Structure formats: structure tokens, C-alpha cells
Amino acid sequence: SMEQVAMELRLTELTRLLRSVLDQLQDKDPARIFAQPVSLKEVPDYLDHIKHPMDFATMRKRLEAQGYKNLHEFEEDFDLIIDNCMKYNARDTVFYRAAVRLRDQGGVVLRQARREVDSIG
Numbered sequence: 001s002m003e004q005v006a007m008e009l010r011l012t013e014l015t016r017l018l019r020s021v022l023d024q025l026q027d028k029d030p031a032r033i034f035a036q037p038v039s040l041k042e043v044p045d046y047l048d049h050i051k052h053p054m055d056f057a058t059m060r061k062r063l064e065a066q067g068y069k070n071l072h073e074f075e076e077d078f079d080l081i082i083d084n085c086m087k088y089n090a091r092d093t094v095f096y097r098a099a100v101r102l103r104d105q106g107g108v109v110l111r112q113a114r115r116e117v118d119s120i121g
Contacts, residue, residue, distance in 0.1 A: 010121065015066050017120075018074050021113045022063060025078060026056050028105040033098045034081050038088075049088050054080035071117045075110065082106075 029035070037055045038046050046053065059077050068074045085099040 011066050011069075013120070014070070014117070015063060015068070017113065017116060018063055018068055018071070021074070021109060022056070022059060024109045025102070025106050028102050028109075029056070029098065031094075031098055033095060034085070034102065046088070050084045052080055053084060056081070071114060078106065078110075 026035075034056050036057050037053055038050075040046055054077050059074075059081075062068060062077070063074075068077075082099045082103045085095055089095040089099075
């Protein structure tokens, strides 16, 4: 159907916008602390602490399979990255501090993306 194609054109465009958002969020992590999943070889107990791990590479595979239906879902994944790190790592660590900084800097980018998703549809 033609409706299905137009739906898919909107999903595709949302995916275009989300990719740019992801790049801008990732630029706020120049240290690359959040680039890849936490290694279960190097942190064997990780899943006893964190039930839903998340990272930028895992978000990117979902993104490129058009697996984000809306900005809310994408934001849920970004918040997992931050929130997982703030639980596992203590306040005085470079990791915890890197999450706080990513959250603060990400807020601006996300604030405008919500306007652009409403605005363009």
C-alpha cells in the first residue's frame, strides 16, 4: 500500500534525524567511555548489578535497523547509558563524572530534537 510506503518514508526520516542526534551526543563523550558495551570478560559481575546494559554502538545497530519508532524510545536508551553508569560507579570516579557531563550536555541536543520531531511531524 501507498500508506505503508509514506509511513516508511517518515520512519526513514526519523532515522535520519536520530542519526544526527546520536552523533552529537557521542561527540559529548570524547573519552569514549560509552562507545561499546561494558565487557563481561573484564567486569564478570556486571549483569548482577545492571539488568539492561546500554552503549552507543548497541544504539547505533538498532538505529540502522530502523528499530526506533519514536524519539521517546531513543531517549530511553540514552538514559540507560547514563543511569547504568551512575549506579555501578561511585560519585568520585571518572566514569560517574563522565555520565553527569554527558547528561548535562546531551540535554540541550535532546531539547531541540523534541522540537524538530514535533515540528516536522
